[PDB]
Write a protein that binds this ligand. Structure first.
Ligand code: MJA
Ligand code: MJA
Length: 424
């Protein structure tokens, strides 16, 4: 029997295997991440989950912030406080900033953008090309409103995404609309009328300009005063190159080679230059920890960023049946883009203010629920907030291209495991 003075413990294989309970979902999931790093499938990742109550506050960091060895021949770790490129995960921040302007009476969401963005209002709609091949433009039908910008229903697209605009760049209309290797998000014309269709575009870059003009502050200052300060965030910024402390610790971008699935250093323009202008659709750097602070505040409805009622509005389906149907047809037919990331590839969705809303449970009682809000950023960053489950989660990588199968699979296992053990 037991040993005098010593805590009773396992003393043979049977009793040690019974004293240590079988591996739960979360433990098994963490093994997958470690194996992915060990086998060089990913450089690293940070995964974070929080509930409203505080009972759940889970942060795990795996692997490295880069594939470039440091001065000591080591690969430095990806940490919860590592400065990372958020890319389109910036869009949530900019959305919150617009809603703050609305709360303070500076703007109305259904107001036309003419007053603050007359430069946008004056922009034409691109409608194919001539029989010869000249650029064919026309005047916009109807007015763009702030709500159209927040829901990507303005008619604006992205140059890399839409065929007409890809041809626009190829024909040379946007050659001088770049700075330090970063293309302007304000130069290109619209590809449809507001209200006509859901189209992913430069809407939040325009929405950012609107904030700057409505407040008389640049977006960086507005961000610091209105998002960072209230949450005690000191490392979230549009202006990475002016923060030598963050520069010393920042992640490098990694790219997966199309040919052999191998990881390589990606010398990304975004890590060497900020751009003079703060682009609200993409330009923020922060750590995973700081981003979670934002998500968690929204989940708590604590009133630090927005009134609880304004946060509730973000989660309400914003599209009328016609656009809702068109958005789902577009997304279901575009698994090569996959805006929804880890979500099932066919799902009934809508768009709120700040992201995609699930209009059905993803897998009954096992995963994200109806009413959950989600979006992401290019380097395989995925965030979601699920008020019914009482959870919000964040899967943070610094790996392009977007929609990497290894990252998506890992992100799914992460979420499934967290929901299995901690959803309520
Ligand atoms: C066909 C459309 C789908 C796309 C899917 C993912 C990316 C965003 C594409 C363009 C971005 C570009 O930087 C990535 C390309 O190098 C992809 C490739 O051709 O290997 C985009 C474009 O190819 C247009
Ligand atoms: C929610 C996600 C939706 C997207 C839709 C189309 C693209 C695949 C986006 C990522 C593009 C990004 O990886 C590459 C761009 O930085 C290239 C460029 O800016 O020209 C993606 C990201 O914006 C996040």
């Amino acid at each position: 029997h037991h040993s005098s003075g010593l805590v009773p413990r396992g003393s043979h294989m049977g009793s040690i295997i019974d004293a240590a309970a079988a591996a739960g979902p979360v433990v098994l999931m963490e093994t997958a991440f470690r194996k992915a790093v060990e086998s060089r499938q990913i450089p690293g990742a940070v995964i974070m989950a929080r509930d409203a109550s505080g009972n759940l506050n889970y942060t795990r960091c795996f692997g490295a912030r880069t594939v470039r060895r440091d001065e000591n021949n080591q690969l430095p770790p990806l940490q919860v406080d590592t400065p990372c490129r958020l890319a389109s995960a910036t869009k949530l921040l900019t959305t919150i900033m617009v809603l703050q302007c609305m709360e303070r009476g500076l703007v109305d969401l259904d107001e036309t953008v003419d007053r603050l963005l007359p430069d946008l209002s004056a922009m034409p709609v691109l409608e194919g090309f001539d029989d010869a091949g000249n650029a064919r433009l026309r005047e916009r039908r109807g007015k763009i409103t702030l709500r159209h910008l927040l829901t990507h229903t303005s008619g604006l697209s992205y140059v890399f995404l839409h065929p007409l605009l890809r041809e626009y760049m190829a024909q040379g209309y946007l050659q001088s609309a770049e700075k330090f290797g970063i293309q302007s998000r304000l130069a290109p014309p619209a590809v449809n009328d507001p209200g006509a269709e859901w189209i992913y575009g430069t809407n939040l870059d325009w929405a950012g300009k609107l904030v700057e003009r409505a407040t008389g502050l640049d977006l960086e200052q507005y961000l610091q005063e209105n998002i960072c300060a209230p949450l005690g965030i000191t490392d979230m910024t549009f202006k990475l190159q002016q923060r030598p402390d963050m520069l010393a610790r920042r992640a490098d971008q990694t790219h997966r080679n199309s040919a052999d699935g191998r990881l390589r250093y990606d010398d990304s323009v975004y890590f060497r230059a900020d751009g003079e202008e703060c682009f609200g659709g993409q330009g923020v750097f922060s750590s995973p920890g700081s981003y979670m602070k934002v998500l968690h505040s929204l989940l708590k409805r604590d009133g630090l960023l927005l009134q609880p009622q304004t946060v509730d509005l973000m989660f309400q389906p914003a599209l009328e049946p016609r656009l809702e149907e068109q958005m789902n047809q577009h997304m279901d037919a575009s698994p090569h883009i996959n805006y929804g990331g880890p979500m099932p590839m066919v799902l009934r969705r809508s768009f709120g203010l700040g992201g995609i809303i699930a209009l059905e449970d993803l897998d009954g009682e096992n995963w994200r629920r109806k009413g959950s809000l989600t979006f992401g950023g290019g380097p395989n960053i995925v965030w979601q907030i699920d008020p019914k489950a009482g959870l919000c989660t964040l899967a943070f990588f610094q790996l392009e291209p977007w929609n990497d199968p290894v990252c998506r699979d890992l992100t799914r296992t992460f979420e499934h495991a967290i929901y299995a053990q901690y959803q309520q």
